[PDB]
Design a protein around this nucleic acid. Structure first.
Ligand SMILES: Nc1ccn([C@H]2C[C@H](O)[C@@H](COP(=O)(O)OP(=O)(O)OP(=O)(O)O)O2)c(=O)n1
Ligand SMILES: [Ca+2]
Ligand SMILES: [Ca+2]
Ligand SMILES: [Ca+2]
Lengths: 419, 1005, 218
DNA sequence: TGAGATTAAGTTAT
DNA sequence: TTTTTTTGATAACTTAATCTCA
């Protein structure tokens, strides 16, 4: 009867159209709207969904690994960066394709995914891939505007643009491996590539084609490589001297490479990629035994337990070196941004983030422990449920608990002065 | 003017709406009073001044404070106080509906606004002055200032009342009368005027009789009238035509009665007589406004109620009469259905349950038996009620199995002397009741004659007077007056609203007295929370005395003690890990000391978090504690009134009223935890439940393993407060007034949400009773604290704890001795459930009694008792399957019809729906019906019961199974067999026996 | 497309095949009332009672329900008369013209728009006096509306208090929309922008939109 | 084709 | 010749249908 219910039903339908790419907030809003509609109007054609299954392969055709003839039209060829794809509808942080759980992101790329995302409404979602602490975009589903326009907007916003081509001649072209190699060489793209996709006017579903070879040769051993601030990655090394790409620790766990054996790794014109298809729970234990006790896997990467002090806090707070508490609190009070950030965040959360501990594992370790706290400061602790001390990562984390509690005490007694 | 006592309040629904009051004077004059009708709004002074169209009227409400009652989750100790704004408020009256956007207190009614604003009680008597009253009509006055007119109050005085108890009887052919083909046959009236003269008269349609029949009737002493003019209400039997009968009914209904009472008359009787009136001659029943301006026609309208769970469906239908003259039309069917919980709600069942007595055999005969009843056979007052109903009764039920016609009746000054036509019976004391009769109405309608017509007239007048008997037995007038006084509502709808509405009157009174307004902005979110605690029973058979200790009004008292109100909730402090939990607990231990604040540790509302503490302030009393305190005071007053009653009817009425007030308090608490309510508070409900759980746990811990020796009683634990330290003695050794020669040990075995069962190693009823009284006195004086009080209910003998909520025992009350007769009580067993069986109840009663006797005499040395039980069970089952002598009434089940189903195509529906589509009678959305399991007669014993719950058919009053249909005895036997085997100790024998004729594995609790 | 036999004056029932589970009960609800109904003259033509029961039903998506025909004059189908001087049809026409932006129109005959069939709750009335035949049509209207709404996505009704017990009259849940004619509301039906509501409800149920432009005469 | 776990509905105690 | 007001909670058991692995 009124307009509020009309607007509510309109927005319910609008969010019902975009359901494949959504998060928990969208799902609960949809459920609330469905309940309200089925209560007010006594019947609604749609029901409540709780699977929250993410599927983007429906927007793409089958993978092409054989020579084929392209159709007449305009072509905008672009490559795809190898790694896990993080799709993102709108208004939140990026979620993971096929997992549903979202991922915390830096505020800069958060600002980018707020501003350049969906210029008005054209793009359903931007496909972001994270590789070696590098967040870069790839082909995205477009319905109203062209992907070239989105690329131009991102370029004028300073985003990292993949090399894009412009092909208009057709001449009944046959796409073969030679053409793919020539195009890849033309694009340079020292970053690893796994496949390409082209943009055609009219058609909505995109086409993905990849050319490579199996080349089942060998594997020799593994090693660790540094990326940034306490960021380590595993790389497999062979007898030739080159390394095969590893997307994450999950890939190594699935491939369960242990010694110099015969495993399937695909070879391309530039790099090589481990097999994506495949004891069990002890692979991580064997890996940590082979690589060193002073290591632990967190999130998508590795990390090393070191010495935590004023240096880590200053690095995480984006400030210079600090010696005494007086000048430290003076510098904290000098900058409004830092003080507002430390006010908006809890002591425990920032103290954990300074040491780069995992989110869930650290919470479980704390929940399986006992502490004694006086004057809002923790000084003694112990572990009650030792049965949880089977994962080597949690033991490595517990090995630095003294440094963690020292950081916690320092944060508490400086925030007491900062009020 | 002068002294006038109010009777009813009613509104006018015309163009210019008015509010009317009907009153009576001391002499007996009816006076109607008219007031203008307004729409009431509450605004702020700024909004009042910003209203560009000046309001018609406005009053200064005064300075009031508005409080936001939203609840937020706090992860730290930085809690911001609630937004309280003090302003000046205006109560404006508008003759039309205005749409002020910033209006507060929008949940109350205009009629309630008038009542509280003018300081006028809905029921009472006032000395009205004539300066504010203008004589509009002869007997109708107008008052433009009801605030000043009703300023004088006087003590209550009794006034005469007019009653019309009516009952019609129609002639049906197949199974139900129709207004288009089936005409009315009898119409019985019990008419009471303002002079106190009671007249009973039945009208018989002469159109159904021939000339010879009319001549015989007029010779026998029946007055035949030809027109409405000559009709006089002095002959108990009047013959007339249908048109004259309908006109007499119209002129009786159009009169300014005080009460027009019928049983299921709004849906059937009034509708039938109206439709007949507008079909035969086409004239309407006209109701006129007291000022003679608005005239309406009678039209029954339907009101539907919705449940608050699931799809919320539809679960109740009621029918009402529209009239603008102050007369109250009452239907006892809806009142009885809503107030009392019984297997069936038919008139015969209600009469059988209500009117019963114990008769002593006086004489015998070849076919007649003489009974006598007085105060010496049954309780005081039962005999008088039986004699009063016997004045018009015709049939009596003996042993709830034999229906016998009354041959001769004699009403004595102290009881009755009834002669019954029943076969000779042994013993000397029997049970008499006024229930079902053994006459089929359709057959006697098919052969209408003189004697049949007179007998049916007698039955109709019996029904008409039975309406009055049920009106007096249920105390409808007293309940109506009390409800009007308490809920602040007109007498016409006191029983028309549920808990969420009846408390709005007192809520508005309290809010205006405290000058408080409560508002909410954020959307309310619903979360599950835990409830009461039930202890698992330690045994199944006791053969020992068990004492029961129960808290008094546990949850309202918890709310009063903790001051749990939505506007007094400081905040909720929650933790995700143990560092934060320890830090915030240490901070909270000192930030909010508990002489004034209270902190309740609840289960976390989210799986992420591990702790949750809700903080409440006990410095200023909340709204919910005050409402609960008022309701508790009313309940205590009516319980005190109950304690001073001698007759059975007074005791029953007062017990029902105090039970209603207890239910009202419980429902107020539940509304505190109801999301759709305006008093929703998740933290308050959680805190109340948690406090109750800790209280019952504390009581059980203290009582369990406690023994008394010499003059001292030793409690298991220290008498320490489970919430915060108190300045009380915590020693568990207490002086005991019992003699030194007493030594017993107590072991807590069971508990339910406020009740604790203590097992005592004693069998003397008197000693156990006095020890229980001593225990309850001690645990009220020392164990409990503040407003928490406990009581000793009764002592249980031969307790059989079947499950965690089911038990059968014999109860000796607090005021009882060993020689006193114990009362067999059941809680949750298959004797109180309405959907098990009648045969199953008898079998389980007999077998439980036999097992109890065997255990008492000393048995269970081996499986001999199990062998005997199995042999008896098999013999009885085989005999009852082969004989097939039990009637269908022993295998009938009852269920309630509704539409609150999560699945649209529920198997429960499509059974009532198909019944309604193939029968003229209709099962309403709250009607209780009957069903039974049936199958074709040519079906042998089935050991694999598959495709069941589809064989059940609805059994109405007129249902006789044919030779091709039979009762599905397997379903009843399987449920009965599974219950008995659970009471035994042998397993392999029970499983092997069960597996034989039932292809399934037994389930053991 | 055949007919049924009733021992009463009309004896003219347009019985379509799709309406098979109606007549076998409808006569039982009408035989006992027709004799008493025909003794009094009625505003609709007595020979015109069942005229909307011949059209196919598995085509429509939304049905508009009227409580009773006009007190004076009647063509059977709701909101159809060559007079164009009323209170309900004129404001509905004005609202639909504002919605669709069409000014020139002569005749609506809403029965002709595909996907919509008008419905009257009570199938008869009296000259001048309205709502005087509820008893004659209660059960018949209940059964007819249950059958109608059994195979319709959304039901549209006019009136708030008039259509108040509809949630209990029919058992199977269905999307029901109730209107609000002005009466004393001072042209409040203009605020009742329910056509867009039913259109977007059909949109949510992946149904073809109903266009308010097929039923026009020029 | 059996056991076993799950879900919906009904009833009572509190 | 057609219009304002509704709506307590959780816990524990039995019986039955329906889907999945073996
Ligand atoms: N229908 C009910 C019955 C009970 N309770 C809750 C609140 C009561 O405080 C508690 C105990 O139930 P009782 O039946 O013992 O009721 P009271 O303790 O309030 O009453 P009494 O004065 O008879 O002891 O259970 C409830 O919420 N709803
Ligand atoms: Ca009767
Ligand atoms: Ca009757
Ligand atoms: Ca109690």
């Amino acid at each position: 009867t009124s307009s509020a219910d009309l607007t509510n039903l309109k927005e319910l339908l609008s969010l019902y159209k975009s359901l494949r790419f959504s998060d928990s907030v969208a799902i609960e809003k949809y459920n609330s709207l469905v309940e309200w509609g089925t209560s007010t109007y006594w019947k609604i054609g749609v029901q409540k969904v709780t699977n929250v299954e993410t599927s983007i392969s429906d927007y793409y055709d089958e993978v092409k690994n054989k020579p084929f003839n392209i159709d007449p039209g305009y072509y905008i060829f672009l490559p795809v960066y190898f790694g896990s794809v993080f799709i993102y509808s709108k208004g939140k942080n990026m979620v993971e394709l096929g997992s549903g759980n979202s991922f915390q992101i830096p505020d800069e790329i958060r600002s980018a995914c707020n501003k350049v995302l969906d210029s008005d409404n054209g793009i359903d979602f931007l496909r972001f891939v994270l590789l070696n602490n590098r967040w870069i975009m790839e082909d995205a589903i477009s319905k109203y505007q062209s992907p070239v326009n989105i690329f131009k907007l991102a370029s004028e916003y300073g985003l990292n643009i993949p090399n894009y081509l412009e092909i208009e001649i057709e001449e009944d072209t046959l796409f073969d491996d030679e053409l793919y190699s020539i195009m890849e060489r033309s694009f340079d793209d020292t970053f690893p590539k796994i496949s390409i996709s082209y943009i055609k006017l009219g058609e909505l579903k995109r086409q993905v084609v990849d050319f490579f070879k199996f080349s089942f040769m060998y594997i020799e051993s593994i090693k660790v490589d540094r990326i940034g601030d306490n960021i380590f990655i595993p790389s497999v090394i062979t007898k030739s001297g080159k390394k095969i790409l590893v997307k994450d620790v999950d890939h190594l766990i699935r491939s369960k490479v242990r010694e110099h054996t015969f495993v399937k790794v695909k070879k391309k014109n530039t790099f090589s990629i481990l097999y994506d298809y495949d004891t069990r729970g002890e692979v991580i234990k064997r890996i940590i035994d082979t690589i060193g006790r002073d290591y632990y896997v967190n999130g998508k990467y590795f990390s090393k337990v070191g010495i935590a002090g004023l240096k880590q806090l200053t690095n995480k707070l984006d400030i210079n070196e600090c010696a005494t508490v007086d000048e430290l609190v003076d510098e904290i009070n000098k900058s409004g941004t830092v003080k507002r950030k430390i006010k908006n965040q809890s002591v425990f959360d920032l103290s954990r983030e300074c040491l780069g501990y995992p989110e869930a594992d650290f919470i479980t370790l704390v929940n399986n422990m006992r502490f004694k706290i006086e004057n809002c400061k923790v000084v003694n602790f112990n572990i009650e449920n030792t049965n949880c001390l089977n994962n080597p990562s949690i033991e490595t984390i517990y090995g630095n608990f003294n440094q963690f509690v020292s950081i916690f005490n320092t944060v508490t007694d400086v925030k007491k002065r900062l009020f | 003017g002068m002294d006038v006592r109010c009777i009813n309040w009613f509104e006018s629904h015309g163009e210019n709406r008015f509010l009317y009051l009907k009153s009576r004077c001391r002499n007996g004059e009816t006076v109607f009073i008219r007031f203008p009708h307004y729409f009431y709004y509450v605004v702020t002074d700024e909004i009042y001044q910003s209203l560009s169209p000046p309001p018609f009227n406005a009053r200064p409400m005064g300075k009031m404070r508005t409080i936001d009652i939203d609840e937020t989750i706090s992860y730290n100790l930085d809690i911001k106080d609630r937004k309280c704004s003090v302003a000046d408020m205006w109560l404006i009256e508008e003759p039309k509906k205005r749409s002020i956007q910033n209006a507060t207190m929008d949940e109350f009614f205009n009629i309630s606004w008038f009542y509280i604003s003018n300081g006028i009680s809905p029921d009472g008597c006032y000395s009205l002055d004539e300066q504010y009253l203008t004589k509009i009509n002869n007997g109708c006055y107008h008052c433009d200032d009801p605030r000043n007119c009703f300023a004088k109050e006087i003590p209550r005085f009794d006034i005469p009342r007019s009653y019309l108890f009516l009952d019609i009887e129609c002639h049906f052919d197949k199974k139900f009368p129709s207004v288009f083909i089936n005409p009315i046959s009898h119409t019985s009236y019990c008419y009471i005027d303002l002079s106190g003269k009671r007249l009973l008269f039945t009208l018989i349609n002469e159109e159904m009789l021939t000339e010879q029949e009319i001549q015989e009737a007029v010779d026998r002493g029946c007055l035949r009238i030809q027109s409405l003019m000559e009709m006089d209400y002095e002959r108990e039997l009047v013959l007339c035509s249908e048109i004259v009968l309908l006109r007499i009914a119209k002129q009786l209904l159009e009169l300014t009665f005080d009460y027009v009472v019928t049983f299921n008359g709004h849906n059937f009787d009034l509708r039938y007589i109206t439709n007949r009136l507008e079909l035969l001659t086409g004239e309407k029943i006209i109701f006129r406004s007291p000022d003679k301006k608005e005239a309406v026609h009678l039209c029954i309208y339907e009101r539907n109620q919705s449940s608050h769970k699931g799809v919320c469906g539809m679960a109740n239908t009621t029918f009402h009469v529209n009239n603008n003259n102050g007369t109250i039309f009452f239907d006892l069917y809806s009142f009885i259905q809503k107030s009392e919980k019984l297997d069936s709600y038919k008139l015969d069942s209600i009469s059988k349950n209500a009117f019963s007595c114990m008769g002593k055999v006086l004489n015998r005969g070849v076919r007649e038996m003489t009974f006598i009843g007085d105060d010496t056979t049954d309780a005081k007052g039962k005999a008088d009620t039986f004699a009063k109903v016997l004045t018009t009764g015709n049939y009596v039920t003996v042993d709830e199995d034999i229906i016998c016609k009354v041959i001769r009746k004699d009403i004595l000054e102290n009881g009755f002397k009834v002669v019954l036509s029943c076969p000779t019976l042994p013993n000397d004391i029997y049970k008499l009741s006024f229930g079902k009769d053994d006459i089929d109405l359709a057959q006697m309608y098919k052969d209408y004659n003189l004697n049949i017509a007179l007998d049916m007239a007698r039955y109709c007048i019996h029904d008409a007077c039975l309406c009055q008997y049920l009106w007096e037995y249920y105390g409808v007038e007293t309940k109506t007056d009390a409800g009007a006084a308490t809920y602040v509502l007109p007498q016409s709808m006191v029983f028309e609203y549920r808990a969420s509405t009846i408390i709005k009157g007192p809520l508005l009174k309290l809010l205006l007295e405290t000058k408080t307004i409560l508002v909410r902005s954020e959307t309310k979110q619903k979360f599950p929370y835990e409830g009461g605690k039930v202890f698992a029973p330690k045994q199944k058979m006791f053969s020992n005395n068990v004492l029961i200790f129960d808290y008094n009004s546990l949850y309202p008292n918890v709310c009063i003690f903790g001051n749990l109100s939505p506007e007094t909730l400081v905040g909720v402090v929650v933790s995700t890990n143990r560092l934060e939990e320890e830090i915030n607990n240490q901070l909270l231990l000192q930030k909010y000391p508990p002489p004034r604040y209270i902190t309740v540790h609840c289960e976390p509302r989210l799986p992420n978090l591990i702790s949750e503490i809700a903080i409440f302030d006990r410095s200023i009393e909340g709204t919910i504690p005050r409402l609960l305190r008022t309701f508790l005071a009313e309940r205590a007053r009516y319980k005190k009134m109950l304690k001073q009653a001698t007759s059975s009817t007074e005791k029953a009425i007062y017990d029902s009223m105090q039970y209603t007030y207890k239910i009202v308090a419980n429902s107020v608490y539940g509304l505190m935890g109801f999301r759709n309510s305006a008093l929703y508070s998740y933290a308050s409900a959680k805190s109340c439940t948690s406090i109750g759980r800790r209280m019952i746990l504390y009581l059980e811990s203290v009582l369990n393993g406690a023994e008394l020796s010499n003059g001292m009683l030793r409690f298991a634990n220290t008498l320490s407060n489970p919430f915060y330290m108190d300045d009380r003695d915590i020693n568990p050794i207490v002086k005991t007034s019992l003699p030194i020669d007493y030594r017993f040990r107590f072991r807590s075995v069971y508990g339910d949400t406020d009740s604790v069962f203590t097992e005592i190693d004693s069998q003397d009823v008197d000693k156990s009773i006095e020890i229980a009284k001593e225990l309850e006195r001690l645990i009220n004086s020392r164990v409990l604290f503040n407003n928490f009080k406990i009581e000793f209910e009764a002592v249980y003998k031969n307790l059989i704890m079947q499950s965690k909520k089911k038990y059968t025992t014999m109860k000796y009350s607090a005021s009882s001795n060993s020689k006193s007769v114990p009362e067999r009580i059941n809680k949750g067993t298959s004797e109180t459930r309405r959907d098990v069986s009648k045969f199953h109840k008898n079998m389980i009663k007999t077998y439980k009694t036999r097992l109890s006797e065997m255990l008492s005499e000393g048995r269970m040395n081996s499986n001999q008792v199990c062998i005997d039980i199995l042999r008896s069970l098999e013999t009885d089952l085989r005999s009852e399957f082969d004989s097939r002598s039990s009637p269908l009434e022993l295998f009938m089940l009852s269920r309630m019809h509704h539409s609150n189903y999560k699945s649209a195509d529920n198997p429960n529906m499509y059974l009532v729906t198909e019944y309604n589509k193939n029968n003229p009678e209709t099962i309403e959305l709250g009607e209780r019906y009957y069903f039974a399991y049936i199958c074709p007669a040519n079906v042998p014993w089935t050991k694999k019961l598959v495709n069941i719950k589809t064989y059940e058919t609805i059994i109405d009053r007129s249902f006789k199974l044919g030779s091709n249909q039979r009762i599905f005895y397997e379903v009843y036997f399987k449920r009965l067999t599974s219950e008995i085997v659970n009471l035994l100790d042998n397993k392999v024998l029970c499983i092997s026996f069960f597996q034989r004729m039932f292809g399934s594995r037994p389930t053991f609790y | 497309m055949n007919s049924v036999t009733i021992s009463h004056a009309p004896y003219t029932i347009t019985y379509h095949d799709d309406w098979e589970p109606v007549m076998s009960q409808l006569v039982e609800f009408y035989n006992e009332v027709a004799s008493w109904l025909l003794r009094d003259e009625t505003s609709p033509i007595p020979d015109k009672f069942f005229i909307q029961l011949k059209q196919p039903l598995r085509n429509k998506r939304v049905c508009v329900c009227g409580i009773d025909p006009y007190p004076k004059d009647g063509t059977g189908v709701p909101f159809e008369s060559p007079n164009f001087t009323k209170k309900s049809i004129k404001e509905i026409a004005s609202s639909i013209s504002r919605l669709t932006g069409v000014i020139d129109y002569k005749g609506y005959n809403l029965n002709i728009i595909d996907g919509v069939i008008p419905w009257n709750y009570y199938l008869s009335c009296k000259l001048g006096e309205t709502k005087s035949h509820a008893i004659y049509w209660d059960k018949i209207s209940k059964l007819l509306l249950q059958h109608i709404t059994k195979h319709v996505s959304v039901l549209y009704c006019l009136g708030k208090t008039d259509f108040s017990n509809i949630r209990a009259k029919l058992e199977s849940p269905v999307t029901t929309i109730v209107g609000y004619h002005p009466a004393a509301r001072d042209h409040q039906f203009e605020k009742d922008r329910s056509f867009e509501i039913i259109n977007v409800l059909l949109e949510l149920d992946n149904k073809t939109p109903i266009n308010w432009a097929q039923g026009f005469i020029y």
